[PDB]
Design a protein around this ligand. Structure first.
Ligand SMILES: *CC(=O)NCCNC(=O)CCNC(=O)[C@H](O)C(C)(C)COP(*)(=O)O
Lengths: 79, 303
């Protein structure tokens, strides 16, 4: 259920995923190169773009495990 | 108009599959491995392959080889002439070798000896004490959490100042799950809980045991270029001061902002971070101040 705006944003922080490879709902983000400081930058970009503040459960490791869970988490905050 | 510093990073979690192929093919690593294997009397790459954990003695020695080699690789392939150098945490060890304060052989011996020393100390001392890293934590938010710990009589020390909102806090792991939820409750994000812990006034006995059993036997030379202390950015110029830096590591916090302000004051505009690293080359403290070259195994493996 995500869109181009979200995926273009995420893919800036996934260095081991090529532009011609699909972004699967359940791909492990850490395995395609999301790491601690990539997450800080991602968070800063998601918060500025969507006018949201990630806090409480939205800052657990589980939030950034897959694009599926991260999209759901961002969605619950934008509405 | 610029000037270049060579920086040596802290050790992140080893991952042999990240570097085993690099180490045996790159000529800079192969040359140091020959020396490390002769000093140690075994195959470091073989011992490191079989090591469990992320911070084994073997992964700490291999991390020394990888950082010191990638500093030389960067100098020879990028025409770098650094005026100054600095090492954060483990990188004090790598900068001692690069600067000439220790022969590479004595740096290998020291790295192995300190590995064994810390293992033994933390087998029995400060049981359950851990070093937490976290980000998006402005000092004002951290200070409120420390006051809550104080109110409950819970011992802690700040172990690293990384950036204005990035700290390491050392305390008993019984506080770990509260700290993590308490950080998140104000928009701060916990990263990692390090065992064994590092950089605490309470670790005087580890300093003393390191000094007696590992460091005092060694001959320290004056570095061939100035070294910035990671404790406070002091510009070091003698072997005695490098030796003091390695001992103070146990009992004084990393102050990364003070390394960056000192480098700036010594006229540095560009830094080379030598070795595998996903903190010192990328953190805002560094990138706001300097052009960064990140001399990683991944870069040196590129065609
Ligand atoms: C120099 C010092 O004292 N550092 C703190 C203690 N050392 C560590 O915590 C080592 C592990 N460090 C790392 O995992 C990375 O440095 C991060 C940035 C703490 C987390 O990286 P991530 O991609 O999960």
């Amino acid at each position: 259920m995500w869109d181009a705006q979200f995926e273009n944003l995420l893919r800036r922080y996934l260095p081991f995923l090529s532009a011609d490879q699909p972004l699967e709902q359940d791909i492990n983000l850490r395995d395609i190169g999301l790491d601690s400081l990539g997450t800080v930058e991602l968070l800063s970009e998601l918060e500025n773009t969507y006018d949201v503040h990630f806090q409480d459960e939205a800052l657990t490791k589980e939030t950034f495990e897959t694009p599926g869970v991260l999209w759901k988490t961002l969605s619950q905050m934008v509405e | 108009a610029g000037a270049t510093a060579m920086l040596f990073p802290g050790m992140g979690p080893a991952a042999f599959s990240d570097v085993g192929r690099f180490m045996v093919t790159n000529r800079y690593t192969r040359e140091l491995l020959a020396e490390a294997d002769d000093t140690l009397g075994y195959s470091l790459v073989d011992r490191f392959r079989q090591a469990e954990g992320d911070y084994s003695e073997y992964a700490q020695i291999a991390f020394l080889v990888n950082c010191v080699a990638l500093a030389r690789w960067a100098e020879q392939t990028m025409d770098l002439t650094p005026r100054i150098c600095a090492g954060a945490c483990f990188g004090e060890k790598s900068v001692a070798a690069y600067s000439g304060a220790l022969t590479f052989a004595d740096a290998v011996r020291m790295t192995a000896g300190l590995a064994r020393c810390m293992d033994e100390y933390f087998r029995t001392e400060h049981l359950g004490v851990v070093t937490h890293s976290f980000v998006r934590a402005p000092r004002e938010r951290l200070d409120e959490i420390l006051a809550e710990l104080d109110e409950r009589g819970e011992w802690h020390e700040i172990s690293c100042h990384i950036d204005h909102d990035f700290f390491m806090l050392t305390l008993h792991e019984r506080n770990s799950v509260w700290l993590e939820g308490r950080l998140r409750s104000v928009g701060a994000m916990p990263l990692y809980a390090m065992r064994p812990p590092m950089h605490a006034a309470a670790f005087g006995g580890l300093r003393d045991k390191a000094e007696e059993e590992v460091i005092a036997p060694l001959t320290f030379h004056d570095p061939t270029l100035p070294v910035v202390a990671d404790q406070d950015g002091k510009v070091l110029t003698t072997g005695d001061e490098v030796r003091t830096m390695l001992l103070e590591s146990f009992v004084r916090p990393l102050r990364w902002p003070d390394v960056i302000s000192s480098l700036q004051d010594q006229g540095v505009t560009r830094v080379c971070v030598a070795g595998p690293d996903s903190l010192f080359g990328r953190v805002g403290t560094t990138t706001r101040a300097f052009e960064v070259i990140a001399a990683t195994p991944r870069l040196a493996l590129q065609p």
